[PDB]
Amino acid sequence: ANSAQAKKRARQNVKARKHNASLRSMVRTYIKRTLSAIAGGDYAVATEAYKKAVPVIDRMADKGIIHKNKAARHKSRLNAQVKALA
Amino acid sequence: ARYIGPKCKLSRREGTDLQLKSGVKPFDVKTKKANKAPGQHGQARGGKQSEYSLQLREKQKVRRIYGVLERQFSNYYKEAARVKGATGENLLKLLESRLDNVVYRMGFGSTRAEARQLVSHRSITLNGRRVNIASIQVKAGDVIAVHEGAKQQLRIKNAIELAAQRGIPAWIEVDHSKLEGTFKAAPDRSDLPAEINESLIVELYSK
Amino acid sequence: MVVIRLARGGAKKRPFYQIVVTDSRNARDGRFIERIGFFNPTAQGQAEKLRLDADRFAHWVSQGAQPSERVASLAAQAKKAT
Amino acid sequence: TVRTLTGKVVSDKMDKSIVVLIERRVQHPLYGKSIRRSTKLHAHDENNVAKIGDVVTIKESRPISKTKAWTLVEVVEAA
RNA sequence: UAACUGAAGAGUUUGAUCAUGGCUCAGAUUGAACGCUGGCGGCAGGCUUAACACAUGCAAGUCGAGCGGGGGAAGGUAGCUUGCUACCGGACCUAGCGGCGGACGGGUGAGUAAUGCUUAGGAAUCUGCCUAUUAGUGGGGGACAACAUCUCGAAAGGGAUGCUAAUACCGCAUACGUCCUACGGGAGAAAGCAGGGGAUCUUCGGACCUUGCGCUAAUAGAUGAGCCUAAGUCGGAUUAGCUAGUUGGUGGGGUAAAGGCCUACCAAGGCGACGAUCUGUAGCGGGUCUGAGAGGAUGAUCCGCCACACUGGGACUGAGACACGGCCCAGACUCCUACGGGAGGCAGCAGUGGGGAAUAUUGGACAAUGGGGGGAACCCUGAUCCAGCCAUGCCGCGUGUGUGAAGAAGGCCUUAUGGUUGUAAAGCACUUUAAGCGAGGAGGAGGCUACUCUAGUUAAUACCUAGGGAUAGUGGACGUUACUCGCAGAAUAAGCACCGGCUAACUCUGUGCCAGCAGCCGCGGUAAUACAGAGGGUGCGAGCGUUAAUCGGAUUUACUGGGCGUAAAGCGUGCGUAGGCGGCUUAUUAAGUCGGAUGUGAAAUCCCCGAGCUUAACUUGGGAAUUGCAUUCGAUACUGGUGAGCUAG
Known part of the structure; x- marks a missing residue:
């Protein structure tokens, strides 16, 4: 059943899967570190993590790895939780 | 299709002259057997008949004169029923x-x-x-x-x-x-001969 | 995209087309948004050949619909006619 | 012009919610006799203003929980 | 002008009779099958059973104007034992990377009794290609297929190392819009390619300018999809209790988006006699058949929605799939193998086996209408169109017409003479439909190239985008097309059922309670008009009969529209729960009820008036209709709600 174009589609699918997985893992790592700082509870340390995390989220949202609505939700909620610290 | 067969057998059976012999001689002189049905048991026209029998003979009489088979005749009757006015007269106009x-x-x-x-x-x-x-x-x-x-x-x-x-x-x-x-136009019922009766046919189809 | 095109109908050897506005992904003789005229290639006697509604045609063309080549030619014919 | 339905409160146990029984009268499709019909609708009342026995009016809204999509408007008759 | 005009009964219980009551028959219809028979054309239909298993071929490709390599045919210059060699660049082609498509189009009805469908509404959402508008497209870098080398295996396809371009990927710069914001501020993009001309002019075949196709951020439209509420939608009580994320709230998580969608805690809720839970069966609507109507039966072919793709569980990529001809895992099955290893899913069109009473070609073309790609040329398309087969249905046509008895011959009957086949046949005259042979010949083709003009680009009458006119060229599978005109001659062409009553049409012979016929009453023991043949008739007719199935007749489930003393049928009798219904007067409300307006009720189908088909079927233009649903404004006699009064219950 397979044809040349179908096989080509499958190979491209594999490559894209690996690339997108790496970038999305980067996003999650930064968000997790920001949450860890919030748990630590120091206002300055938490805001520094927030500043260092926001650009990566914006970049991958622009690339389309995640949706811009999800990026905005993350930024809003993280900023609120950082502000509640102090 | 078409009915190819003897005409005078059918004319004698119907009991009245159907005018299928061109009238060059009198129909009576030509057939010399009218009022007697063609067959071994052929009996005079005075024999009694049933209600369904008369209803059927009327339709057969019209069909024989106008050379129309049963399917086309039934379509004609249904068309006359659809058309406004007296269905019986409309049927004759259609014929x-x-x-x-x-x-x-x-x-x-x-x-x-x-x-x-x-x-x-x-x-x-x-x-x-x-x-x-x-x-x-x-x-x-x-x-x-x-x-x-x-x-x-x-x-x-x-x-x-x-x-x-x-x-x-x-x-x-x-x-x-x-x-x-x-x-000019469809001949009127008064112009059409009064020998034919259409009510019997209407009841035949209504049954 | 939204298109204006001809849907087939009638009998064998004698097609009759409805000019319909539809989404291009729908089947030729299936779902459509609006019917705005007809086209009878083999009209004879009193039969009318082309009837196109210019107001709706202009409205849909303004809303981004793309006519097919045959419908464009017929619209030109109707423009010349009226 | 929100759709509005008037009924009477029948429950108040839940937090920030009320249950109202709504009744309609329609003719029978085959026999024509006027017959009673009723439905129970869950509503949202943030301040717990309504209680059991009162007549209330409710309107349609976006879902607030799994079963609640209607909101209180006014208490027509206090119990 | 119109859009409806419609209702029939018969047979059988008894020595008679009336009623009750079941059975049977006359009608319409079918995706039909079988039997006998069989000429033509037009329009439609054609595996209802095994969602059984599948040989073989075909059904998703296109772009070199995104990119680097590679290949063969030609051309030119210089040298030559025999027209050739050695090198050069131009056109052409494509295995690979990349873009778009592949999620449409096509098939099926297994599952699904509500996660679905129909009708009417709503707010919390995303949306490639298309249309309109706004602000841009700056400058760098690392991979990596191809390719080269080495290897495994018979091959199919695998493994290792060294290269490499880009509209493949990633950083930096900038930000009208855009996102977060504690309102102070912070954050995030993109890619080039083609052509023309200034005749400027080369950090080298360059740099500058316009145009076009592209790319990035954003708003709106359109389209498509996701989500929510109300009413409606099959049988069973010999199925009465069911539910612990269960019902609700708070913090957090998660989604494009509301939400127990997920989670920790808190509370004990939530559903059910207006049928919860359980169980059986089933895709649903527009429609279709039947019927005077009410109603009943039904979901082939046409259209909208849903679900599914050998069985089950998953995600990936992408605007969009949890994807019929994509990927992974498990199961069953099948195939190749050189035993080291591999491959597959017709409920896509043909076709094969099996099943069954039963349903067709392993055909042609992209010419027409659509779909994918492309700037175009053009390529792909079992969608589609066209052809093949089948009396399967409907409609039309033919199988000759006029003649002519001194009533021929023959068969059959007979009260042995006469009657019936019978104007029938023979003989006479005459035309030629359809088919058969020969010549012409429309339409489905709109259009495109060639010449030349008007408007726009703005440095540029160049290039390119829109309009026009006659010609020349050009393009059709069906197609020896429909259709028209010539010649021959009645020459090529009719069967099936039935004749006691229902029911139109009767006799002889052979045979006898045997053979047999039979929908019901019935017929058959030597004078059967009911059995077999024959004559004559009757009703249909390229058809005629039987079987199977639904509605009707059936007022035998009775809403329209039935019954319970003796025919079937009042519980052995009370009391009472839910429910149904409820006296008189008055004021108020406007739920029931009634009236008006707006929106909606897709198209096709039904009916009405027209048009094109030689007619009809059929196709088609408009109207009516869709008898409903929702919103809103009005009326208050009756029913219901509320307040008050009264006495005949």
């Missing part, structure tokens, strides 16, 4: 408006059978067209003319002689020298 019957009543056919063959062989023309269907219904204002090949025919000459012997109906007007005539 009268046939191209071959109109050719007969206009006077270029010795018999309705002969008119059927003329139409089938394209010796007749509706307006300027060489039609070849006898079931065509002729609308008001139509012009039944003869074809050039049909003209100069001994059979046609004899047919117009017989037509001159006969009386042309009022609604048709045909010039025999030009071999063409025209149709």
Whole structure:
């Protein structure tokens, strides 16, 4: 059943899967570190993590790895939780 | 299809002259057996008949004179029922408006059978067209003319002689020298003979 | 995209087209948004050949619909006619 | 022009919610007799203003929980 | 002008009779099958059973104007034992990377009794290609297929190392819009390619300018999809209790988006006699058949929605799939193998086996209408169109017409003479439909190239985008097309059922309670009009009969529209719960009820008036209709709600 174009589609699918997985893992790592700082509870340390995390989220949202609505939700909620610290 | 068979058997069975013998001699002189049915058990017309029997004989009588088979007759009756007005009279108008019957009543056919063959062989023309269907219904204002090949025919000459012997109906007007005539409108019920009864047929189909 | 095109109908050997506005992904003789005229290639006697509604045509063309080539030619014919 | 339905409160146990029984009268499709019909609808009342026995009016809204999509408007008749 | 005009009964219980009551028959219809028979054309239909298993071929490709390599045919210059060699660049082609498509189009009805469908509404959402508008497209870098080398295996396809371009990927710069914001501020993009001309002019075949196709951020439209509420939608009580994320709230998580969608805690809720839970069966609507109507039966072919793709569980990529001809895992099955290893899913069109009473070609073309790609040329398309087969249905046509008895011959009957086949046949005259042979010949083709003009680009009458006119060229599978005109001659062409009553049409012979016929009453023991043949008839007709199935007759489930003393049928009798119904007067409300307006009720189908088909079927233009649903404004006699009064219950 397979044809040349179908096989080509499958190979491209594999490559894209690996690339997108790496970038999305980067996003999650930064968000997790920001949450860890919030748990630590120091206002300055938490805001520094927030500043260092926001650009990566914006970049991958622009690339389309995640949706811009999800990026905005993350930024809003993280900023609120950082502000509640102090 | 068509019914090809003896005509006088059917005429005697119906009990009345159907006018399928061109009338050159009297029908009585030709058949010399009227009032007696053709068969071993043929009995006089005075024998009693059932209600369904009379209802059936009426339809058979009309069908035999007008040369129409059962399927087309039933379609005609349903069409008359759909059409507004008296269904029985509409049915007779539909039968009268046939191209071959109109050719007969206009006077270029010795018999309705002969008119059927003329139409089938394209010796007749509706307006300027060489039609070849006898079931065509002729609308008001139509012009039944003869074809050039049909003209100069001994059979046609004899047919117009017989037509001159006969009386042309009022609604048709045909010039025999030009071999063409025209149709005004559907002949009225009063013009149609009173021998035929249509109510029996209407009840037959209603049952 | 939204298109204006001809949907087939009638009988064999004698097609009769409805001019319809539809989404291009729908089947030729299936779902449509609006019917705005007809086209009879073999009209004879009193039969009318082309009837196109210019108001709706202009409205849909303004809303971004793309006519097919045959419908564009017929629209030109109707523009010349009227 | 929100759709509005008037009924009477029948429950108040839940937090920030009320249950109202709504009744309609329609003719029978085959026999024509006027017959009673009723439905129970869950509503949202943030301040717990309504209680059991009162007549209330409710309107349609976006879902607030799995079963609640209607909101209180006014207490027509206090119990 | 119109859009409806419609209702029939018969047979059988008894020595008679009336009623009750079941059975049987006359009608319409079918995706039908079988039996006998069989000429033509037009329009439609054609595996209802095994969602059984599948040989073989075909059904998703296109772009070199995104990119680097590679290949063969030609051309030119210089040298030559025999027209050739050695090198050069131009056109052409494509295995690979990349873009778009592949999620449409096509098939089926297994599952699904509500996660679905129909009708009417709503707010919390995303949306490639298309249309309109706004602000841009700056400058760098690392991979990596191809390719080269080495290897495994018979091959199919695998493994290792060294290269490499880009509209493949990633950083930096900038930000009208855009996102977060504690309102102070912070954050995030993109890619080039083609052509023309200034005749400027080369950090080299360059740099500058316009145009076009592209690319990035954003708003709106359109389209498509996701989500929510109300009413409606099959049988069973010999199925009465069911539910612990269960019902609700708070913090957090998660989604494009509301939400127990997920989670920790808190509370004990939530559903059910207006049928919860359980169980059986089933895709649903527009429609279709039947019927005077109410109603009943039904979901082939046409259209909308849903679900599914050998069985089950998953995600990936992408605007969009949890994807019929994509990927992974498990199961069953099948195939190749050189035993090291591999491959597959017709409920896509043909076709094969099996099943069954039963349903067709392993055909042609992209010419027409659509779909994918492309700037175009053009390529792909079992969608589609066209052809083949089948009386399967409907409609039309033919199988000759006129003649002519001194009533021929023959068969059959007979009260042995006469009657019936019978104007029938023979003989006479005559035309030629359809088919058969020969020549012409429309339309489905709109259009495109060639010449030359008007408007726009703005440095540029160049290039390119829109309009026009006649010609020349050009393009059709069906197609020896429809259709028209010539010649021969009645020459090529009719069967099936039935004849006691229902029910139109009766006799002889052979045979006898045997053979047999039979829908019901019935017929058959030597004078059967009911059995077999024959004559004559009757009803249909390229058809005629039987079987199977639904509605009707059936007022035998009775809403329209039935019954319970003796025919079937009042519980052995009370009391009472839910429910149904409820006296008189008055004021108020406007739920029931009634009236008006707006929106909606897709198209096709039904009916009415027209048009094109030689007619009819059929196709088609408009109207009516869709008898409903929702919103809103009005009326208050009756029913219901509320307040008050009264006495005949």
